[PDB]
Design a protein around this ligand. Structure first.
Ligand code: HEM
Ligand SMILES: [Ca+2]
Ligand SMILES: [Ca+2]
Length: 336
């Protein structure tokens, strides 16, 4: 098939996404930058997808429709979940966009995440299937994992959805390109790692550092201590990095940074299609750009040493990674 601007799709129905791609890379991702709107976007893929409980379904109860765009269709309901605070912003930006192209909301949300992550340095190229219904029902509450939930409860929430523990760690790779706004509003935009626009293993490293700093005037529900100024640290992430169910895979992304993108692509492709039949969708992965950027060597921050690493696995010693030189430069917030 032939699409706009001299472009080609194996399947004709994918042709609309090429023009969607042009719009969001300009009028949402600012010339395809890996910034706030990509971060929000990528986070939005999860808040839509995870509204999916087969355990609830098995009991004659509605268990959510996963990647069905309901968070957008029923924004009023869903975004006033406490687990969904700060989410209404990127929903209300995306909504008019997906309307003009008459793509379904579920399709659109998975698209923006797939597109934006490709904008990130050493970013992943996420599979993108299309044709999700635009008819669904709002997600039941309390399905989204909270940063103050226990690992045990978090594993069980994602296992219910479909994920084994290894896969959760993989998905969390998204935190490399991430900051918070609602745990501590006064620290809004401070990233979970030192390089929030690179898709690198720095998140897995800095999560294993000891928490030594209180960045705000106090700590908060779901927040623990940071290892570095400018950096925020989630309770859930600190735990998962050290939990013996998850510590070794957490570490695997450090000892083998090449494995991070393909492992994260696999799991994302599951997530983008929770509550969906892939055999009932068409493959428009072509539209999603090839990411630029080499896999970076993971480094220990300036001022840090292997002594600062809370090594939590068990089968395999921590890898000998070099320390950055100089004094540590306090980490700049993600732009407004
Ligand atoms: C497994 C349970 C998870 C928990 C408990 C969790 C928790 C959080 C929290 C508390 C924030 C900060 C939100 C705020 O207050 O502004 C955040 C940010 C973010 N999360 Fe996660 N998350 C989880 C899984 C995921 C997954 C599966 C993805 C994507 C695959 C993801 C992608 C993101 C992104 C991209 C951000 C940055 C948002 C921004 O910078 O505006 N998270 N997460
Ligand atoms: Ca949903
Ligand atoms: Ca990063």
């Amino acid at each position: 098939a032939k699409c706009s601007k001299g472009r080609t799709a194996s399947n004709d129905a994918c042709c609309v996404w090429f023009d969607v791609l042009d719009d969001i890379q300009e009028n949402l991702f600012d010339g395809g930058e890996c910034g706030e709107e990509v971060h929000e976007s990528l986070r939005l893929t999860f808040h839509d997808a995870i509204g999916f409980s087969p355990a609830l379904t098995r009991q004659g109860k509605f268990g959510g429709g996963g990647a069905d765009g309901s968070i957008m269709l029923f924004s009023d309901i869903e975004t006033n979940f406490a687990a969904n605070n700060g989410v209404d912003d990127i929903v209300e930006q995306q909504k008019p966009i997906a309307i003009k192209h008459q793509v379904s909301f579920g399709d659109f949300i998975q698209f923006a995440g797939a597109v934006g992550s490709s904008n990130c340095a050493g970013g992943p190229r996420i599979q993108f299937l299309a044709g999700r219904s635009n008819v669904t029902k709002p997600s039941p509450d309390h399905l989204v994992p909270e940063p103050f939930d226990s690992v045990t409860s978090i594993l069980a929430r994602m296992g219910d959805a479909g994920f084994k523990p290894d896969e959760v760690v993989a998905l969390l790779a998204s935190h490399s390109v991430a900051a918070q706004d609602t745990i501590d509003p006064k620290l809004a935009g401070h990233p979970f790692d030192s390089t929030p626009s690179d898709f690198d293993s720095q998140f897995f490293v800095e999560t294993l550092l000891k928490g030594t700093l209180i960045p705000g005037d106090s700590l908060h529900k779901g927040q623990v201590k940071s290892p570095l100024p400018g950096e925020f640290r989630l309770q859930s992430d600190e735990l998962l990095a050290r939990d013996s169910r998850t510590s070794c895979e957490w570490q695997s992304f450090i000892s083998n940074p090449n494995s991070m993108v393909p492992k994260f692509e696999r799991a994302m492709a599951k997530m983008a299609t929770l509550g969906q039949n892939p055999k009932k969708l068409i493959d428009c992965s072509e539209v999603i750009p090839v990411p630029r950027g080499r896999v970076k060597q993971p480094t220990l921050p300036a001022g840090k040493t292997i002594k600062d690493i809370e090594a939590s696995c068990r089968k395999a010693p921590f890898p000998r990674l070099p320390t950055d030189k100089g004094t540590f430069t306090s980490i700049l917030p993600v732009p407004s």
